[PDB]
Enzyme design. Structure first.
Site, PDB file in Angstrom:
ATOM      1  N   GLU A  35       0.813  -1.208   0.000  1.00 31.81           N
ATOM      2  CA  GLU A  35       0.000   0.000   0.000  1.00 31.81           C
ATOM      3  C   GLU A  35       0.852   1.266   0.000  1.00 31.81           C
ATOM      4  O   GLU A  35       0.570   2.210  -0.752  1.00 31.81           O
ATOM      5  CB  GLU A  35      -0.952   0.056   1.202  1.00 31.81           C
ATOM      6  CG  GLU A  35      -2.114  -0.912   1.157  1.00 31.81           C
ATOM      7  CD  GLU A  35      -3.105  -0.633   0.037  1.00 31.81           C
ATOM      8  OE1 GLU A  35      -4.006  -1.475  -0.199  1.00 31.81           O
ATOM      9  OE2 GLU A  35      -2.986   0.471  -0.565  1.00 31.81           O
ATOM     10  N   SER A  50     -11.375  11.964  -3.415  1.00 36.30           N
ATOM     11  CA  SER A  50     -10.921  11.470  -2.119  1.00 36.30           C
ATOM     12  C   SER A  50      -9.436  11.156  -2.226  1.00 36.30           C
ATOM     13  O   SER A  50      -8.895  11.027  -3.334  1.00 36.30           O
ATOM     14  CB  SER A  50     -11.681  10.196  -1.727  1.00 36.30           C
ATOM     15  OG  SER A  50     -11.340   9.088  -2.528  1.00 36.30           O
ATOM     16  N   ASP A 101     -15.571  -4.376   9.119  1.00 37.26           N
ATOM     17  CA  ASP A 101     -16.809  -3.814   8.577  1.00 37.26           C
ATOM     18  C   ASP A 101     -17.566  -4.765   7.691  1.00 37.26           C
ATOM     19  O   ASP A 101     -18.601  -4.383   7.154  1.00 37.26           O
ATOM     20  CB  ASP A 101     -16.517  -2.474   7.879  1.00 37.26           C
ATOM     21  CG  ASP A 101     -15.928  -2.620   6.506  1.00 37.26           C
ATOM     22  OD1 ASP A 101     -15.780  -3.748   5.991  1.00 37.26           O
ATOM     23  OD2 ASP A 101     -15.602  -1.557   5.908  1.00 37.26           O
TER      24      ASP A 101
END
EC number: 3.2.1.17
Length: 129
Positions: A35, A50, A101
């Protein structure tokens, strides 16, 4: 801050990621590698305006508030700037919410492509934990 591999492995363990939601420590180190290349200051702008922030590339639409993103919900209740800190607490705490989530670590596109299903424990081998 650019963490070293073993440096980050140890820090993630001190922040409770080993086996969190069933994901061994190497998953988390591997995710950070692909990442952010272990850089707490990493950012990535997206098409929708974003931005992804920090060592685990957490997005400013659902998760953190950067004051510049449409459709902001700030579910981690933090400014996105906190995800750029040398102290990984805010990134870890928010990552724990994300992974819980309903989608597990599939939330992290880099993890899905370079970590999932591999010998992820290689990312922590040789390190003092």
């Amino acid at each position: 801050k650019v963490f070293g591999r073993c440096e980050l492995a140890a820090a993630m363990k001190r922040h409770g990621l080993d086996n969190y939601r069933g994901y061994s420590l190497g998953n988390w180190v591997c995710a950070a590698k692909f990442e952010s290349n272990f850089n707490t200051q990493a950012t990535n702008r997206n098409t929708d305006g974003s931005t992804d922030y920090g060592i685990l590339q957490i997005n400013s639409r659902w998760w953190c508030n950067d004051g510049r993103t449409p459709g902001s919900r700030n579910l981690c209740n933090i400014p996105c700037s906190a995800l750029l800190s040398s102290d990984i607490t805010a990134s870890v705490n928010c990552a724990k919410k994300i992974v819980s989530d309903g989608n597990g670590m599939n939330a992290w596109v880099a993890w899905r492509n370079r970590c999932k299903g591999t010998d992820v424990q290689a990312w922590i081998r040789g390190c003092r934990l």
